[PDB]
A paper describes a structure:
In most bacterial species, faithful chromosome segregation is mediated by the tripartite ParA-ParB-parS system. ParB, a CTPase and DNA-binding protein, nucleates on parS before spreading to adjacent non-specific DNA to form a higher-order nucleoprotein complex. The ParB-DNA nucleoprotein complex stimulates the ATPase activity of ParA, driving the movement of the parS locus (and subsequently, the whole chromosome) to the opposite pole of the cell. ParB spreads by sliding along the DNA, in a manner that depends on the binding of a co-factor, cytidine triphosphate (CTP).
After screening several constructs with different lengths of ParB and parS, we obtained crystals of a 50 amino acid C-terminally truncated ParB in complex with a 22 bp parS DNA. This protein variant lacks the C-terminal domain (CTD) responsible for ParB dimerization. Diffraction data for the ParB∆CTD-parS co-crystal were collected to 2.9 Å resolution, and the structure was solved by molecular replacement. The asymmetric unit contains four copies of ParB∆CTD and two copies of the parS DNA. Each ParB∆CTD binds to a half parS site, but there is no protein-protein contact between the two adjacent subunits. We observed that helices α3 and α4 are packed towards the DBD and are connected to the rest of the NTD via an α3–β4 loop. While the DBD and helices α3–α4 are near identical between the two ParB∆CTD subunits (root-mean-square deviation [RMSD] = 0.19 Å, Figure 1C), the rest of the NTD, from α1 to β4, adopts notably different conformations in the two subunits. Specifically, NTDs (α1–β4) from the two ParB∆CTD subunits are related by a rotation of approximately 80o due to changes in a flexible loop in between α3 and β4. In the nucleating state, as represented by the ParB∆CTD-parS structure, helices α3 and α4 from each subunit bundle together (32o angle between α3 and α4). Nucleating ParB is an open clamp in which parS DNA is held tightly (nM affinity) at the DBD. The NTDs of nucleating ParB can adopt multiple alternative conformations, and crucially there is no contact between opposing NTDs.
Residue numbers in the entry:
A (entry chain B): 44 to 74, 81 to 239
B (entry chain A): 44 to 57, 62 to 238
Write the structure that this text describes.
DNA sequence: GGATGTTTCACGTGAAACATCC
DNA sequence: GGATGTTTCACGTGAAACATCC
């Protein structure tokens, strides 16, 4: 890990516009984990960030003249890929955003579930079940982000026919996940 | 600490997480502002006060719809700055359970806060605050297993009240027992 | 009665087990 | 056979219930 001026690092225009909560950044600012960089295609002696955009922003706030980088050369697709795998590992994301990240890793980057799981540190089951939530009706996906349903609830009624009817039953009756599992079990499937 | 209308307080002109504020709001809703707000006479108004410490609970009380909130006309004592420093550090949530327990013990002893007070402040439940602190009563051996990972909070908490906890900890690790199992183990201690 | 000490157990998670597809 | 699709259920957390102290 080489020391580098904070001036000569730049964010990746290609990988989507990451925004971070002021609170989280003010916290980090106030708090020596190297930033993963690669030689800048735009400049010559400058580096581009592949991972650690938060700490970079935090270091700027903390007023450091020079910040620890760790360089490695990397295809534009590899930097897109690491960008998504980093974003998932952040605990900020919600389950639908998390599922999309898994779908994109699997489609556009031809990764196996088992691959994604090993990479992101969860289990394959989890990766699989998370993605399945994208198959749910819009109505049911609304309840997931509103908070009216939990992942556990939604996942247990994914395989049912007329999930919306079960979701309504769950909310009205304030049912547990265990209860919904028994409900969906004795209901037809599509 | 005199009770004062929420109307007559104002912020220091020189972000708080919705979740955290909704939580506090609801605590103040049930138990009321358990920790006085430090104020000083308003330079802007005349009969109004300006807040020196407790902007969060003020905002929380407004959400809870309290007509009047407990104030204390007082400046920031070095102990007040030590106190805020610890309460901020706990809220960060980077810290581990033993560090968390110490923070609660110090808030309770050196700053004479009630468990219920600490809970409302830091946003966990009283039980939790109580049970977390109890882990400090465990032998060093057992506290080692908590940070090593060999035991979980749930395990340790369930054998705190036992005599010879170390013997139970050894039983747990050797037998790879669940928390439910340890609860049944400790339950059949004689008393 | 209200602060503190301790136990009990319903909860959603998460991954292992099982089922089906490629 | 190994990836993927889905179900089942053991797990620790977390907070309400219970117990004890002043």
């Amino acid at each position: 890990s080489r020391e580098a001026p904070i001036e000569i690092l730049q964010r990746n225009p290609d990988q989507p516009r990451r925004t971070f909560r002021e609170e989280d950044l003010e916290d980090l600012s106030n708090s020596l984990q190297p930033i993963l960089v690669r030689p800048s295609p735009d400049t010559a002696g400058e580096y581009q960030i592949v991972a650690g955009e938060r700490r970079w922003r935090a270091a700027q706030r903390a007023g450091l003249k020079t910040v620890p980088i760790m360089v490695r050369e990397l295809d534009d697709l590899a930097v897109l890929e690491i960008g998504i795998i980093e974003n998932v590992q952040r605990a900020d994301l919600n389950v639908l955003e998390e599922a999309l990240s898994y779908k994109v890793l699997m489609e556009k980057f031809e990764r196996t579930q088992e691959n994604i799981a090993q990479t992101i540190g969860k289990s394959r089951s989890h990766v699989a079940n998370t993605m399945r939530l994208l198959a749910l009706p819009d109505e049911v996906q609304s309840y997931l982000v509103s908070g009216e349903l939990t992942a556990g609830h939604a996942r247990a009624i994914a395989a049912a026919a007329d999930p919306v009817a079960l979701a309504k039953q769950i909310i009205e009756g304030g049912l547990s996940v265990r209860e919904t599992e028994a409900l969906a079990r004795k209901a037809p499937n599509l």
